Design a protein around this ligand. Structure first.
Ligand code: CA
Length: 223
């Protein structure tokens, strides 16, 4: 997250870190057994880390749970990042508490202009590289579809939305991928892509989770 703030330990209790020997992507706990992330974050051998603040220190509220299954969307296209969503099943149910909690899925899609909370352990520099140890947060508005298409002509599908600040300076970034965009208490986006981070006229692009609720529900009913 570039231009964000320190969230505060466990104040984003649905935020997970996906670990394969190191943090590589975020995700969102949607119930005791299931995490939503980005398909482009797929790796074999994922351990889901819940209750994290500093990902390099055991602070006492973590639950580390292996993935048993990962399910990339049937129509994910890594070339265009269309359908950039994945489900991860945990080997055992998380113990839900004040610091480890699920986030609601949407019923309706989010409105343009809504201020959402984006969070992660990704790079905090727009030019160069610095990865934070503690969880970072950013408040960012959903941009209009017209504005998003203008920014990335020929590349925005109906399953994507833009959010952030066209003047630059505030965005998600590498390493935030797969983590949440929460709007009115619902998981409305997944950190997906963008040209660079926090660059002028290049806002972040996010998977539009409300297009996937029927797939999420039937997949979890079946696995
Ligand atoms: Ca920790």
């Amino acid at each position: 997250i570039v231009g964000g703030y320190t969230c505060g330990a466990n104040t984003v209790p649905y935020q997970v870190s996906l670990n394969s020997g190191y943090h590589f992507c975020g995700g969102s706990l949607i119930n005791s057994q299931w995490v939503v992330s980005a398909a482009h974050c797929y790796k074999s051998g994922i351990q889901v880390r819940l209750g994290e603040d500093n990902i390099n220190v055991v602070e006492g509220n973590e639950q580390f749970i292996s993935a048993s299954k990962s399910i990339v969307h049937p129509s994910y296209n890594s070339n265009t990042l269309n359908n950039d969503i994945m489900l991860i099943k945990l080997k055992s149910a998380a113990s839900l508490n004040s610091r480890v909690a699920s986030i609601s899925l949407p019923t309706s899609c989010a409105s343009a202009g809504t201020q959402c909370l984006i969070s992660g352990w990704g790079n905090t520099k727009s030019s160069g590289t610095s990865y934070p140890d503690v969880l970072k947060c950013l408040k960012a508005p959903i941009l209009s579809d017209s504005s998003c298409k203008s920014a990335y002509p020929g590349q925005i599908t109906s399953n994507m939305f833009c959010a952030g600040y066209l003047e630059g300076g505030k965005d998600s970034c590498q390493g935030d991928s797969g983590g949440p965009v929460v709007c009115s208490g619902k998981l409305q986006g997944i950190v997906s892509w963008g040209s660079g981070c926090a660059q002028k006229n290049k806002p972040g692009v996010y998977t539009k989770v409300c297009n996937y609720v029927s797939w999420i529900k039937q997949t979890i009913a079946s696995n």
